[PDB]
């Protein structure tokens, strides 16, 4: 039962920005973490009860407002490169009781960029089963790639006749750099559908591999000639072939 | 309180067991929790202990050792679901969480009748597909820019009851015969012309 | 080393009377105010300097969010007693949470909670249970009981975690709390209603505050009426106690291994 | 259940005429917490007086020490003037 708002959000560097959280489990306490690659969860700001509100281990670039007992906002004065990570807003009944866990929201996505000019949507394509592995398996796997997109936030889903599936699909957890030695490298997302020979061989089954993109909003300022990187939806399909 | 430590990857085998070690080192002592988080997902409670012993929650059973400082998440008849980073966090003497780094868990499937295989699949409008292999093989990264190599996925035909391994190759001179060179590749892989 | 004990109290007033804070919780080692926070306040502050000299500021910072925080919790615990209770106007609500580290070196812990400054719930760690004075003492007993990590982590606290404590601050305080100050220890007698003797044993300057006074005839106990003193505070860190009888006698005290006696 | 409270008014060290000394006044086992103390020379209020913060007994009542640096004479007339809500008016306790 704790609401955290916006699951995704691109910055550019001296921005502000607030972090909204909710609970409605009538919890005293709440909390705002970041997450970071290879670190335990390091708290930014804690609210103990209402009325109060503390620094907690990474306070610097960031304030709170503890509103009332069900709110507990956050916000980015500056926002600065440094301050791209996940956001995690938790509460607990209460502080100082040992058993007391901690009940967290769904996480915010912030990334925080010098200029919007690298900010790209995915390029999608389907790959068909090869013949090769229908012949040796009597299966039929369908590949998708998610490409140049940048910064990583995509949403990668197969749709099989205006369906969607999640049987026989593996999606990569963790999307690869394009460009390794490169600080703003663009990213690249793979998938997999996995069918039998003969739900391929149909030529009425209809495959649709879809990848949500959450970039530029409305406010954000472009002048580049190509169209705006807005979030977005791109998409890529192949029809049942025999 | 100052230091926890727990391991940053385990791999373990699909109905085996797993046991995740937490030791921690500080400044008193209010309590040890382990909170699961599936890749992309926020972080759930799964056990408390503050006294010593061993308390079970389905296939989950948590330890606790006052005496030596540390605790264990075990988890039993390991099942493909269970992919997932375990925090550990104590509360110290102040009831401050400190955060271990976590630990992800990878489980092999178990692959009842390999054949590896590596496919080309071509645009609907190319791709290399290294795929069926057993669980043992790992897939290594391309040594050579502008050649793109996804690590190891299992999907899962739940109808079928089948589970299969895959890792995607593909570039812009780049061949599905030298795709996975860089990886250590099972002897039997089918290469079709 | 003698028996010492840690304490911590809380005093929450409903509805106060001008002057009164709504809430008060103070820290003792022994018989020494060791910590205070209030609601007018709203800080956690030493109260011993051997307190504020020994503990960082970050104990101070955050003591006082979680003070700040258990303020809340008995405002809202105090509003549920009433209105179990039917209760309207000014009430109290206290707690008293501590243990004691004996000079045998066994270990005592204790958790117990009042209602209009009468026994309410009182925490047993053996057992794990809360033991309710009256039905509406059975509610919140039942509603705490149904928590067993908040049990074990009661446990865990009053048989660990506070003896610690309580062993830091014996090391701090260790110039005042460790010291021994003899009793200055005198007989006085009197004629006072015509044909009555009085015997009047006195003692004063002494610390620690714990001594025992007794009256003895040719070496046996004194079945007479004894009347005693209170021990009370000189001021000074120090403390003054008597003991009274009427007509060998003997005034016996004994104070931190030190037995001596005054024959009259 | 109010506790109303138990007076005592006595000298630090034995007295003397003539000799400095410190004049206490302890006050406790009462409930509830709310309390007036304050100590008296010939019938007015000290001015300069010290006293400890409210102090909690295991009981649940509570107790405070009230003291001030007198020179006791054999004229002079020391008490301790309390206000309780189980009191009616203030009670002046005397030192005996």
Known sequence: ????????QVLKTG??????????????SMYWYRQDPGMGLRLIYYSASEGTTDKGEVPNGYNVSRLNKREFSLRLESAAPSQTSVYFCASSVWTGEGSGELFFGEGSRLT????????????VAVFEPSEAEISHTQKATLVCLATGFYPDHVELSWWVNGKEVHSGVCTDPQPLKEQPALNDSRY????????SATFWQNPRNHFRCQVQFYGLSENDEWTQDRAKPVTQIVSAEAWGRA | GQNIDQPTEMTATEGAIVQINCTYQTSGFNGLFWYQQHAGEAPTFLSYNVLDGLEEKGRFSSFLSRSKGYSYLLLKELQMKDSASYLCAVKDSNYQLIWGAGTKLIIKPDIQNPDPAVYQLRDSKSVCLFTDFDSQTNVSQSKDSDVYITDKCVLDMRSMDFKSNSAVAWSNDFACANAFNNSIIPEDTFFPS | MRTHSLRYFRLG?????????????????????ITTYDSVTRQKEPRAPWMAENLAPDHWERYTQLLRGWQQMFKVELKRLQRHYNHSGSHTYQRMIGC??????????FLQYAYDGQDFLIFNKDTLSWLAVDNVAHTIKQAWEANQHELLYQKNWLEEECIAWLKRFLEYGKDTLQRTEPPLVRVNRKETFPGVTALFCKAHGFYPPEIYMTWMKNGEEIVQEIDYGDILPSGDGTYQAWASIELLYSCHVEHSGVHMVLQV | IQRTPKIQVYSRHPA??????????????????????????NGERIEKVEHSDLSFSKDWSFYLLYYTEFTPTEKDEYACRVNHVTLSQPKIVKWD
């Open chain 1, 1 to 8: 039962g704790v609401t955290q708002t916006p699951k995704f």
């Open chain 3, 13 to 33: 007033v409903s509805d106060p009377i001008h002057g009164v804070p709504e809430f008060i919780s103070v820290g003792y080692v022994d018989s020494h105010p």
């Open chain 1, 112 to 123: 925080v960029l010098e200029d919007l000019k690298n900010v790209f949507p995915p390029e």
């Open chain 1, 15 to 28: 921005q502000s920005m607030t972090l909204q959280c909710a609970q409605d489990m009538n919890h005293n």
């Open chain 3, 100 to 109: 004691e580290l004996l000079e045998d070196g066994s270990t005592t812990g």
């Open chain 1, 188 to 195: 690249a997302l793979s998938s997999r559908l996995r069918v």
């Open chain 4, 16 to 41: 003397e005429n003539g000799k400095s000394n410190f004049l206490n006044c302890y006050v406790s086992g009462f409930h509830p917490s709310d309390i007036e103390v304050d100590l008296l020379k």
